[PDB]
Amino acid sequence: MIKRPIELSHDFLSQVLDKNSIAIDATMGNGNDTVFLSHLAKKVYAFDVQEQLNIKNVQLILDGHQTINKYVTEPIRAAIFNLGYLPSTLTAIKKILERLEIGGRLAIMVYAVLNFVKELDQQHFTVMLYQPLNQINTPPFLVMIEKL
Amino acid sequence: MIKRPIELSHDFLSQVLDKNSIAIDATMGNGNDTVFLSHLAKKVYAFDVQEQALIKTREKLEQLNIKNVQLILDGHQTINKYVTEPIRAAIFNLGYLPSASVITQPATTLTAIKKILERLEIGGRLAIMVYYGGDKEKDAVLNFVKELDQQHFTVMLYQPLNQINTPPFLVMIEKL
Ligand SMILES: Nc1ncnc2c1ncn2[C@@H]1O[C@H](CSCC[C@H](N)C(=O)O)[C@@H](O)[C@H]1O
Known part of the structure; x- marks a missing residue:
């Protein structure tokens, strides 16, 4: 019954979204988060380098989430970001944080960024880590950022 | 609004408590968790090693x-001598109260955690608030809960990342 990080990421964003909100999906890929967000928000902007x-x-x-400031102009209520690559961003996050409205939220699922969010001023942002401790295969964890 | 670890601890425990439930406050202190638990549970066992804690808590109960x-008035590590029934929820608030210096200690803390986890009902929850020899206890608790078998326990860390002065954090444990 305890929430998995991915479940809390949805809950965290859903709690502040409404049909007046603009949301960003900075890491589109499969489109699952885009769909989830489209049902809760006025409009959703989604980014991916892959066609x-x-x-x-x-x-x-289709062009680097770091090019946010060139596509979205309005204040952002909620954003989701995925971090980490499978065996085979920082300016983007910074720009999203700047564009978030007061009370706005950014969810970073992690499958230099950590160093950056840690450095945020606590009077203007609350940054929380939500991480499984006893999983045998190294699982994803969640960084929750709320703009104060 | 985003919850502080202390607020999440209360939410985490209240979600599984009811008037059939036995609850443990392993670190009575000034009694604030004891009072909270008593409102939701059938019965609460609260532990402290300082007489002052019982005096202050007694006053709130009255x-x-x-x-x-x-x-x-006995260490939480002695819990099995006092509590026979299965436990629904438990809380620890580690690291000293404003009254001198009788801090919680790694061995006693971990012994109490182990016994409580053995006694928890399926679906039962343990909340540990870690205040930080603050670091030796921190590390010992983290090291202990990380080795809990994932098929029997789900262990989550809830910790502030951008605050100065080493703020407390929450370890949530749910028995599967
Ligand atoms: N072995 C033990 N068993 C039960 N309680 C203990 C104990 N060792 C220390 N304690 C008690 O644990 C309590 C911790 S209260 C500290 C809470 C937190 N630092 C805050 O600021 O709110 C103290 O009352 C202390 O007397």
């Missing part, structure tokens, strides 16, 4:  | 006419 439900309130952008 | 709490 049905009649949604229509979503804009897909 | 004011509120609380009848379902047993105060115990």
Whole structure:
């Protein structure tokens, strides 16, 4: 019953989203988070470098999430970011934090950024770590940021 | 609004408590967790090693006419000598109260955690607030809970990342 990090990431963003909010999905990929966010927000901007439900309130952008300041102009209520690469960003996060409205939230799922969020001024941002401690395979963890 | 670890601890425990439940306050202190627990649980066992803790907590129980709490002047490591029933929820608040210096200690802390985890009901929860020889206890608790078998326990860390002066953090444990 304890929430997995991925579940809390959704809850965290959902708690502040409404049909007046703009949301960002900085790491589109499969589109699962885009869909989740589209149902809760006025509009969603989604980004990926890689090129049905009649949604229509979503804009897909193909060009570095770090190019946010060139695509979205309005204040942002909620944003989700994925971090970490499978065996085979910092300016983006910074720009999102700047654009977040008061009470706005950024969720970073992690599968230099840590060093950066740790450095944020506690009077202007609350940054919390939510991390499984006893999982045998190294699981994803969540960094929750709320703009004060 | 984003919860402080202390606020999440209360939420985490209240979610599984009811008037059939036995609850443990392993570190009575001034009694604030004991009083909270007594409102939700069938019965509360609260432990401290300082007489002052029982005096202060007793005063709160009297004011509120609380009848379902047993105060115990003995280490939380002795819990099995006092508590026979399965436990639904438990809390620790580590590292000293404003009254001199009788801090919680690694061995006694871990012994109490182990016994409480053995006694928890399936679905039961243990909340540990870690204040930080602050660091030796911190490390010992982290090292202990990390080795809990994932098939039997889910262990989550809830910790502030951008605050100065080493703020306390929460370890949440749920028995599977
Ligand atoms: N072995 C033990 N068993 C039970 N209680 C203990 C103990 N060792 C220390 N304690 C008690 O644990 C309590 C910790 S209260 C500290 C809470 C936290 N630092 C805060 O600021 O709120 C103290 O009352 C102390 O007397």
